[PDB]
Amino acid sequence: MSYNYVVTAQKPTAVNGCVTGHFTSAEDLNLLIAKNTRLEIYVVTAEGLRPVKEVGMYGKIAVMELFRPKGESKDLLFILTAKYNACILEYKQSGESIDIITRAHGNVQDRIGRPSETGIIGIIDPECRMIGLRLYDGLFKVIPLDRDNKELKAFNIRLEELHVIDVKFLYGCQAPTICFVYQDPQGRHVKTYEVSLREKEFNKGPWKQENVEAEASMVIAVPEPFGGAIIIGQESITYHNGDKYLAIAPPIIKQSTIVCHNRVDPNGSRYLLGDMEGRLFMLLLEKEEQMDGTVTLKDLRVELLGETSIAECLTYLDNGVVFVGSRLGDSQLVKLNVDSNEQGSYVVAMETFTNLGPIVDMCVVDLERQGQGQLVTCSGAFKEGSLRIIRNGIGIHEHASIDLPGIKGLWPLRSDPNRETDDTLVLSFVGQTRVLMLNGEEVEETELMGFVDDQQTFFCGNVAHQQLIQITSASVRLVSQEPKALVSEWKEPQAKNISVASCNSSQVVVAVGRALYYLQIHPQELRQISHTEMEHEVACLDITPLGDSNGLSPLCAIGLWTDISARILKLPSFELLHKEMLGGEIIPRSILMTTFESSHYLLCALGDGALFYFGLNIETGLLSDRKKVTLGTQPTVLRTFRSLSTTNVFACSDRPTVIYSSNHKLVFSNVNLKEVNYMCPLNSDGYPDSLALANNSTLTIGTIDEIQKLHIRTVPLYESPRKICYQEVSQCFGVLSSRIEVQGTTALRPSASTQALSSSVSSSEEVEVHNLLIIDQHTFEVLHAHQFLQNEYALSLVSCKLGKDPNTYFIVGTAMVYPEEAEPKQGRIVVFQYSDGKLQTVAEKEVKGAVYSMVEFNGKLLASINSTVRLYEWTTEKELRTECNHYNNIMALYLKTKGDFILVGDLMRSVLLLAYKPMEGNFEEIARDFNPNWMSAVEILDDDNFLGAENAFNLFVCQKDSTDEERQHLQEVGLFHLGEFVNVFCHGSLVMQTPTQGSVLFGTVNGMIGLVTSLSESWYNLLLDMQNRLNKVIKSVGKIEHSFWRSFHTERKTEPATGFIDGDLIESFLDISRPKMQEVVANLQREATADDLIKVVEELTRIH
Ligand SMILES: COc1cccc2[nH]ccc12
């Protein structure tokens, strides 16, 4: 009945866990990072983190642990998903082919059980005898480790202690032994059990239970020679081991709860600890010797090292380097120094990694140009709180601009053999060449002895033996550097025109119609080595040297007229190594051999905007795994450039693009420029690390931004942003924020709300103090901060005009929060006017509850207050006055409107459709969803389709059912397990303003950004069929079924997804092998071809 398409615009960025070990090989040190559904694998080096392989799971990663059974040469990886998919994984590399293989898998869900409270815990014994899982209170699930247990069959042990806080397997025990903290009415306790595989039961543990701190929260199992356990609490750190017990209560940890630990030394001599304010501690275990040669713990000490991002996890990586994995802020690499600095920190940040999460609110604004949407998010929490401004495509920063029409090519040149930077830019035109010299930022015409100015240049550059080369339509000219003289000139035997040229430092290949000539550059000599006659006219050439080649190519890449071939030829023989026919009647225009992330590719652009690319074996010349993207509608010219120590390809067309690599796949990102015809890198004194760009009229020089799909600007607030709205008439944002103060109350640090240009107050981890920030849309400076009342929490924000009043106001809805109130019984609506650098209060209305949500509605103000939805009019006396009320809610948390229709999202009874009835001045309840759902966000897709997100990470779509009692039942016609928690939906697009209609973005807790759009039945059916066929050919990590992953799942209900296409799966079509493609298309509704589908999937990827 309803047809929706959901796709990832930004993958989750928050770090949910991190481990180290030897996964990729015995000798490698790896960091593995879990970002919800993604697993990232790195090799740790001296340079830092080298990415080797990233994969998606069809599940939320809940457990991730490396372990090494006997009879394994390197670590295996245990993953458990939130839907109880268990797997054992092995890394396997053969060639440039990397696979994660599933060694064992099965689902370990029980029929009876509600999830525990400190969540899923999975632990592995040091001796690899078993995996232990705490999934439900009162049960401990054991998976015997045994290479024959490939289905990961398990048994449950009754656990007497119902409320386990944390649990680990101990080192140095004769039988597998767990150590855990649990809570009963008599307080918190630490206890141990042995786990008997024979008996499938617990046995008495090696040491008796002890009482621990009331807030003991984490168990650390200390390796030999210490053995035993460390128990971290809020006020205390204790060690336990047999008839051995040691406790410290260091005041330095008491300010903030410690929430993560990491072992620095293999023998447990030192641990890192991180708290909720980003403090980083070293915990140091002092050894005591014994006559029998055992080692016992003499003492524990804690030292403050400094401050990091608020850490979800810490991993020491050797050589003083720590990876700080953050959920609430940016992740980091930090370095620990033996000696402190001028402020006393031992911690020095080396590198910062972008985390958008949590995205708690966002909005779309055409900040810079019309039709070019940017997303502005409220991101992070506490000291990590920020605005993030997200926009598609790569920017150029223009530093020079010269009027100079009709450029046909650009080449940079080093005219001085003693200087490393370019000093010369050579320009081609129809029938002509011009040379520009660069003196600082000055750019002047000039002649260059040796070069001719009265032929068109096809190539010029530095070549071997301190020489320059110019290849024109007439000849190849070889020029000495000092002085500039012609030292050798090559012409075709009858002086026919050169039609195509390619050149590296020591080799030249020129075409003359169908003929090819191969020259070598020697001292004062162009040496003709070989020639051939191609079957057809030559369209394009390349001899870019790849690999450990010494600047020499054994290969010549060629594109031909007529058969539209790309071929790899051997030099010097010109023997055909490999031929690919590209199809059509439109010739190749640009061909390039290139290397990305150490793999070799052949790129070939046609004049219609198509780019084909292939893997290239530089040994055999074999092309493989053809793929095709469309880069425009005009001839593309390809050119290599370096930025930030990486080689990329710039593609000039009507739509300039950078081609680059990410996770060993080619990626394409728009450059934010009008049409570019030609470019070259340029690295001169006055224009370091730059690009020269030409169109029909202009020559530009500038620098390029980071090569990435999305550009992110960060605005640190140093406090928690909560909501955002844009006020066009003021050219600013309003942002609700809260900061923590300690009980007067005292701030922990300066932040946006205490550092505004001007400030105002309302007149009447200890306390939240709430503020409305006014933020400039261009500088993101905090222009003004208005502070609310003590214990007043700001929940809702809108910028709008009301009634016949021409002013635009910021309107804020609040709650008065008191400790023993089940919910708030009091709050305000406050109308503010931003004028002359400050907020003035124009009006207030006290209400008897929390103002959760507000929306402008037809010149009126719609607000949700506890269990009520209310519409206010703005009177001539500038007051809000109730028009009508709706009462039939539990807790009305979310509103959206369209026309006279109102979608209401409830705490627990899903969604409800109201209509305002303009001839009766009241609401009519049209229909509601009688299926209970715990809502997190709502959106109206159109008059008949309503989108919900709920707390168990599902989407659904409701429609009207086409009695009166029947018409009042909304039908859930779409269901989809997204696997993210949606905080906000908002209509809009990051793509400059079709198989899809409409555009709704959403932001999530993990910093994932997604898009929802609508499909026709026809499109839905085709794509559903594609999914089903894709799911047969794709091998999933852990052998999870896609249909299982995407099934709607709450504690009440599991059902197959319906009415939803998984765009991430569809887009993965462009990454499968061609045998697989063919397989996917066999008999698919005329009979579709691979290439039809490749086209269809491209149209789809363009919507984000
Ligand atoms: C369930 O345990 C296994 C599965 C797969 C491979 C393994 N190697 C040693 C134990 C093991």
Ligand SMILES: COc1cccc2[nH]ccc12
């Ligand atoms: C090491 O790489 C990361 C870790 C955490 C977040 C990240 N964002 C971009 C890269 C990245």
